[PDB]
Design a protein around this ligand. Structure first.
Ligand SMILES: [Mg+2]
Length: 192
């Protein structure tokens, strides 16, 4: 039940933000619900890093230096409602990474290096009310963009809700035109 040496704990919250950390601290108590890991220098999460924190409802890992996530890294976080991943350098997300987050209402992916989202990545996010996708270099010439294009069109009111610019603030790299307007004929699997 003890609070990790580098962090401070209050109620169900574990505060590990702004602590110059390179890794998630060991020994976070398993009953804690809100975990702040933002504003550190975490460059890589090890697989399974969060597996014991089955009560988490809030997880913020924004403003770190992550380029990828391990397969399954959120799979045990059944209660998660808010997931902050902004201000990293993710170049891709793993297939299936959000499949086990049925209570997730907020997903913050803005300010990264994402070029597309894998087909079906949001299939099981049946509670999602806010997703932030702006400030990513979306690759609109590659046909892999078509899942995201069709998903944001369908669910326009949940994408970048005010004041974050709406569905139109999901922009193609280079041309800076809206992802929602990409035509299938303008894409190709050979430019991926
Ligand atoms: Mg799938």
């Amino acid at each position: 039940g003890g609070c990790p040496s580098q962090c401070s704990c209050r109620g169900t919250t574990v505060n590990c933000d702004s602590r110059s950390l390179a890794s998630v601290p060991a020994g976070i108590p398993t009953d804690r619900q809100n975990l702040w890991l933002n504003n550190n220098q975490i460059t890589k999460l090890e697989p399974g890093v969060f597996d014991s924190l089955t009560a988490l409802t809030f997880l913020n890992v924004g403003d770190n230096q992550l380029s990828a996530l391990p397969i399954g890294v959120f799979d045990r976080l059944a209660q998660l409602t808010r997931l902050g991943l902004s201000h990293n350098q993710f170049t891709a997300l793993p297939a299936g990474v959000f499949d086990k987050l049925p209570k997730l209402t907020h997903l913050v992916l803005h300010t990264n290096q994402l070029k597309s989202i894998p087909r079906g990545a949001f299939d099981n996010l049946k509670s999602l009310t806010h997703i932030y996708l702006f400030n990513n270099p979306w690759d609109c010439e590659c046909s892999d963009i078509l899942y995201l294009k069709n998903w944001i069109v369908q669910h326009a009111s949940i994408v970048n809700p005010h004041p974050y610019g709406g569905v139109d603030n999901v922009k193609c790299s280079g041309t800076n035109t809206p992802v929602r307007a990409v035509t299938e004929a303008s894409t190709s699997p050979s430019k991926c």
